[PDB]
Amino acid sequence: IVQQQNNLLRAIEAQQHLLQLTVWGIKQLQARILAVERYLKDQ
Amino acid sequence: IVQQQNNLLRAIEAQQHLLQLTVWGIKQLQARILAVERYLKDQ
Amino acid sequence: IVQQQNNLLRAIEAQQHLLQLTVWGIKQLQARILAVERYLKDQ
Amino acid sequence: MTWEEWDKKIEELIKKSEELIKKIEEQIKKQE
Amino acid sequence: MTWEEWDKKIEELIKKSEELIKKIEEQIKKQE
Amino acid sequence: MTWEEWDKKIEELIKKSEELIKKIEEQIKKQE
Secondary structure (H helix, E strand, C coil), rough: HHHHHHHHHHHHHHHHHHHHHHHHHHHHHHHHHHHHHHHHHCC | CHHHHHHHHHHHHHHHHHHHHHHHHHHHHHHHHHHHCCCCCCC | CHHHEEEEEEEEHHHHHHHHHHHHHHHHHHHHHHHHHHHHHCC | CCCCHHHHHHHHHHHHHHHHHHHHHHHHCCCC | CCCCHHHHHHHHHHHHHHHHHHHHHHHHHCCC | CCHHHHHHHHHHHHHHHHHHHHHHHHHHHCCC
16 A cells, blocks of 8 residues: 555656646746737837 | 655645646636737727 | 545546646637737738 | 636536545544 | 647646556555 | 735745655655
């Protein structure tokens, strides 16, 4: 059953990396929409 | 080993809060791109 | 305590589906901002 | 898929995830 | 980082996560 | 909520999550 926990941990480690990748994307999109909003305002 | 599960749970609780924060950001960005799409259309 | 792991697994399965849904949204927003960026460029 | 469908699925999965965390957290307190 | 690299890393991590969930779910059925 | 507050909460939760993964991964090596 310690084999189980080692696998429960491996699934959590995989989801930890997925979360960091989603955060990366959200930051990128936020910067891109901001640049567009500023462009339309400057015009 | 019950100490282990209490720690497996703590990691899941931390990822549960990370997910709610990503959902918050996605909703914000969706509203901002929609306002831009509507602006360009109204012009 | 095997009842516990079955519940630890159920929480992970729920977060696995939440992650796939966030990824879906990020892809949608990325395509929509790209179409806007291209529109402003073509004008 | 529609964004309002997205809102519905997200909210259900979050609630379910929260109720599962409560379940686990209580089965520990029944011992520790 | 490129968005197509992002698509590649996401898909690999999801597949890996799914195969790990199957592993765990079977080691429970071998008992319960 | 402000995006800089968002950046702060995200970073704290990630660090905490990483330190918890290290904790678990060591308590396994103390046995297996």
